[PDB]
Design a protein around this ligand. Structure first.
Ligand code: MG
Ligand code: MG
Ligand code: MG
Ligand code: MG
Ligand code: MG
Ligand code: MG
Ligand code: MG
Ligand code: MG
Ligand code: MG
Ligand code: MG
Ligand code: MG
Ligand code: MG
Ligand code: MG
Ligand code: MG
Ligand code: MG
Ligand code: MG
Ligand code: MG
Ligand code: MG
Ligand code: MG
Ligand code: MG
Ligand code: MG
Ligand code: MG
Ligand code: MG
Ligand code: MG
Ligand code: MG
Ligand code: MG
Ligand code: MG
Ligand code: MG
Ligand code: MG
Lengths: 70, 271, 67, 88, 129, 104
RNA sequence: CAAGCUUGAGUCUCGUAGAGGGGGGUAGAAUUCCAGGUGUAGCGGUGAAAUGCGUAGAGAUCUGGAGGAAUACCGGUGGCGAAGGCGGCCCCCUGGACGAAGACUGACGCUCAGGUGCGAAAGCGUGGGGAGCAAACAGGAUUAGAUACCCUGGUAGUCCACGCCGUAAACGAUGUCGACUUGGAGGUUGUGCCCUUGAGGCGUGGCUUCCGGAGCUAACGCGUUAAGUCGACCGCCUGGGGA
RNA sequence: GUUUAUUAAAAACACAGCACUGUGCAAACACGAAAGUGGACGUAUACGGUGUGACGCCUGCCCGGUGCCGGAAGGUUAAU
């Protein structure tokens, strides 16, 4: 969030460091979820669905390697 | 403790009675008693000034200490009594040296408790000390407007005043009405809130209970005659004028306050 | 599973320590998730409480700016 | 629950060998002591329904335990009732 | 709660036969030993041996003929929720004679043929086929 | 009895009478039969965030073994006194007598 | 019926984790108002517009103050709890679960018609509180119509304490307990021993996730936490509407 | 219960309950050219006024107009 430009730094890299710091901190991603209200019911639904999909994609990717030589 | 009464008869149908088993039963402390005759709403001219007042039951004025300016010597409360001249209860507090007084009963205080006045006292419900030592945010009661005049603010059944600021010489406090008022720092106030808080829960039940309190019935203006009241007159339940007092002053909305002397003390008007 | 504690045996994270505790908070005053730190479930759970205690005692800032 | 010193004292005063730790009388005394100690707890925190169920479980176990003792041999149950203060 | 040791024994032996277990160890009892004697006298099990001083355990060894289990169906008839008592002339006949129905009678725990030969009934326990 | 740990910050304006406060607190503890095991002042240092429009406070830590009554009395004294800004009280199961990572 | 026994069950002694419950305090982020300063012609909003806020100085910025709710990251198919449900921190009281070794109590064990208790949210009564959100309602907008979806405000309510009803997709659409019946990959939490050179290995427990063999099912699917084979008990179902 | 003594005793007034409004104390208000008093030797759980009138379900829409309150950006405006 607080990105002070060091001595003798180009504007392009100075802004790139700010952008990377913002992306790592996740500021733009917090407003996109705090703009509207999400009930605990749908919050748990989304969490469970995301976990299931994350589990299934990994399992499918690991199980698809031992088939279809090329 | 509010007790619902059985509907054995009309008048008993809707009565509830606030009962405190800790209240003393018997005669009060005779040396501190006095005489308080019923005025009846008549000033020193025989004219009725505040109507709807009269009758009731004989009472006796008990001397209640609203100052508590005894620094040092701590006293102990012995019992509580019901004061007919007010809505709260009075605690009979006796000092270590022989001396009994009547104090406004705090919320948590019961029989056998100890209270110390002065400005060397400790923060505890019942103690009295100036605003210069009371921490900000405290809920005091029986607040004095000026040093030595006596406690006047928030001394009802269940009222209190909370401190919000103190910038040296003046201390800002929010009264029970909901407005802030600066007071001198040297003023004294008892800690905590008054004891009997269920007083508002009582209901009279019948017209007789109001005559017991000593309030005459109130007659609506619209049922009177035009000479007796502006709202009077008509060939029925007619009413075609703005609601006003019997002396031609607006009732609904009209703010009646002209005291300009006490205007620098008020921080914000009540809302 | 206490990767940062296997060779140390601290067994108890104390909010007094800040030198080895500020490595678990990012520049914006946020705790690095155990998914990234590789910390044991109990050690990360107690380290979060220690960081909260430090923040209460004003040893670690709540946010990057904290005006 | 009861402190270690109190539990040891109750076991010593209610056990035949002062080391039984689990006999019928010892269990009854421990349960009654816990119930009596929690009686003063269930007067300021009457909304503690997550501990009221536990107290009810203790009461039910004590009652079943006393009924078993009375059915098996009524020779110490009558003495235990008088010594401990239970109504039945 | 364990409320039928005989049903527990039948379940254990049936599960062992289904899962191709060599032998099935379990807590034993006098009635369990009596039933195991009848089961061994008919070739349904290999053998059995009680092991233990304070907590005896039966160690029944199953028999497998050509892979398939020898015992087809063992069904507990008289369960401890509905007692079944049959006279001498009312005894059942499993698979028209090819199966047995263990019966506990006054002379002991015998089979259908033994009970009919002796001329007395008893209460049935289970059907073995 | 139970082992407690009190860490409190107080204003820099009266950082010369802090030993007096420490002496009064330990005198009260030993009068109420509390075994003080660990006690040290970290001095004056900066704060993570501004508290009451000041950026530098004074830290004092004390691990003692004191009864709940005197612990509550000390907490009430801290609440009443305006010199002490913030006081944290922890209930520890063991009497720690080691140096803080602060004092080195 | 009378004697015995510990394997069922319950208890002691020591540690372990946990948003378990009740009560009281404390600290920031943020939203909204009050007062002041700088500052000028826009702000807000939508697919687009206007109702709305603005020259009475809006929005923005900074300072101080007022008050309410919940505690960003930690945070997970993670934990606790019979269920509902539970998430800053601290203190006070307390329920429940598991494990290392030790002795006794000796069937004291499971279920349960009536009965009692708890029981999401919404709802009602009393006394307060009320920042944001938001039924009812007001205005703008699309549409042939729009008593809606969208936008600008906005009352009850959401909050606190004591009270009242006992309703849910109160869901794992799977009532409680016992033992038996192949495995793999994990998650959390103990415990024994090994050279603990790394979250090194070999066993043993408690909870839980995914895949799957036999078996079961009309199929989907369940699959050692069975919807596989049983035992003890309670409740319910007998065509769809009418209900 | 009270009400027109002496043609109207009732559906008329009062009533407990409920709502609104003003009132920080040298309080509002009323009697008094003023002193002063009642309110009250009370202190917003109190007082006064105005509406309806035990209790169960509720008080739905509208500020065009007249009152009341908040504001003084602009116009007019007495005495001086
Ligand atoms: Mg009146
Ligand atoms: Mg009235
Ligand atoms: Mg009339
Ligand atoms: Mg006249
Ligand atoms: Mg007139
Ligand atoms: Mg009229
Ligand atoms: Mg008329
Ligand atoms: Mg008319
Ligand atoms: Mg008209
Ligand atoms: Mg007029
Ligand atoms: Mg516990
Ligand atoms: Mg029932
Ligand atoms: Mg609710
Ligand atoms: Mg809104
Ligand atoms: Mg809306
Ligand atoms: Mg409500
Ligand atoms: Mg239902
Ligand atoms: Mg269901
Ligand atoms: Mg049950
Ligand atoms: Mg669980
Ligand atoms: Mg499967
Ligand atoms: Mg009459
Ligand atoms: Mg007449
Ligand atoms: Mg006067
Ligand atoms: Mg009327
Ligand atoms: Mg009505
Ligand atoms: Mg109306
Ligand atoms: Mg208007
Ligand atoms: Mg005006």
């Amino acid at each position: 969030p607080v990105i002070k430009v060091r001595e003798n730094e180009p504007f392009d890299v100075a802004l790139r460091r700010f952008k990377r710091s913002c992306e790592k901190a996740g500021v733009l991603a917090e407003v996109r979820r705090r703009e509207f209200y999400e009930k605990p019911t749908t919050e748990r639904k989304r969490a469970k669905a995301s976990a299931v999909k994350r589990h299934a994609k990994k399992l499918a990717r690991e199980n698809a390697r031992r088939t279809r030589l090329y | 403790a509010v007790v619902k009464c059985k509907p054995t008869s009309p008048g008993r149908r809707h009565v509830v009675k606030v009962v405190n088993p800790e209240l003393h039963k018997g005669k009060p402390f005779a040396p501190l008693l006095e005489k308080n005759s019923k005025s009846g709403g008549r000033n020193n001219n025989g004219r009725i000034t505040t109507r709807h007042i009269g009758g009731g039951h004989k009472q006796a004025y008990r001397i209640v200490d609203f100052k508590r300016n005894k620094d040092g010597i701590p006293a102990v409360v012995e019992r509580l009594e019901y004061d007919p001249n007010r809505s709260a209860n009075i605690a009979l507090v006796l000092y270590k040296d022989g001396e009994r007084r009547y104090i406004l009963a705090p919320k948590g205080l019961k029989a056998g408790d100890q209270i110390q006045s002065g400005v060397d006292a400790a923060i505890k419900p019942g103690n009295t000390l100036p605003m210069r030592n009371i921490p900000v945010g405290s809920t005091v009661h029986n607040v004095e407007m000026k040093p030595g005049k006596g406690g006047q603010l928030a001394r009802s059944a269940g009222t209190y005043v909370q401190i919000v600021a103190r910038d040296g010489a003046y201390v800002t406090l929010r009264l029970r009405s909901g407005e802030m008022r600066k007071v001198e720092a040297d003023c004294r106030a008892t800690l905590g809130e008054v004891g009997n808080a269920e007083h508002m829960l009582r209901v009279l039940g019948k017209a007789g209970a109001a005559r017991w309190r000593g309030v005459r019935p109130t007659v609506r203006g619209t049922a009177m005659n035009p000479v007796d009241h502006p709202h009077g007159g008509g060939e029925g339940r007619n009413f075609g004028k703005h609601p006003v007092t019997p002396w031609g002053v607006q009732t609904k909305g009209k703010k009646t306050r002209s005291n300009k002397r006490t205007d620098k003390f008020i921080v914000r008007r009540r809302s | 599973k206490f990767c940062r504690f296997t060779a140390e045996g601290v067994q108890e994270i104390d909010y007094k320590d800040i030198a080895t505790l500020k490595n678990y908070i990012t520049e914006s005053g946020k705790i690095v998730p155990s998914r990234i730190t590789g910390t044991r479930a109990k050690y990360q759970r107690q380290l979060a409480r220690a960081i909260k205690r430090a923040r209460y005692l004003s040893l670690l800032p709540y946010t990057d700016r904290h005006q | 629950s009861l402190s270690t010193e109190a539990t040891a004292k109750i076991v010593s005063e209610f056990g035949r060998d002062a080391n039984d730790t689990g006999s019928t009388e010892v269990q009854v005394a421990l349960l009654t002591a816990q119930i009596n100690h929690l009686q003063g707890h269930f007067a300021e925190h009457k909304k503690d329904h997550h501990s009221r169920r536990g107290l009810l479980r203790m009461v039910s176990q004590r009652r079943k335990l006393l009924d078993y003792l009375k059915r098996k041999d009524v020779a110490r149950y009558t003495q235990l009732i008088e010594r401990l203060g239970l109504r039945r | 709660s364990m409320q039928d040791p005989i049903a527990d024994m039948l379940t254990r032996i049936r599960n062992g036969q289904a899962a191709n277990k060599a032998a099935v160890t379990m807590p034993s009892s006098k009635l369990k030993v009596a039933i195991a004697n009848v089961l061994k006298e008919e070739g349904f099990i290999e053998d059995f041996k009680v092991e233990g001083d304070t907590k005896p355990e039966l160690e029944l060894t199953l028999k497998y003929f050509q892979g398939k289990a020898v015992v087809e169906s063992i069904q507990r008839v008289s369960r401890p929720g509905l007692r079944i008592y049959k006279r001498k002339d009312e005894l059942p006949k499993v698979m028209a004679g090819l199966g047995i129905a263990v019966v506990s009678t006054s002379k002991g725990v015998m089979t259908d043929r033994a009970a009919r030969q002796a001329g007395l009934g008893g209460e049935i326990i289970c059907y073995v086929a | 009895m139970r082992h407690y740990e009190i860490v409190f910050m107080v204003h820099p304006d009266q950082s010369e009478q802090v030993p007096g406060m420490i002496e009064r607190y330990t005198a009260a503890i030993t009068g109420a039969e509390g075994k003080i095991h660990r006690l040290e002042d970290w001095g004056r240092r900066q704060l993570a965030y501004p508290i009451n429009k000041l950026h530098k406070a004074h830290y004092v830590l004390m691990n003692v073994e004191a009864p709940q009554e005197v612990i509550d009395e000390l907490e009430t004294t801290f609440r009443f006194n305006d010199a002490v800004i913030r006081s944290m009280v922890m209930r520890t199961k063991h009497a720690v007598t080691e140096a803080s990572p602060m004092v080195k």
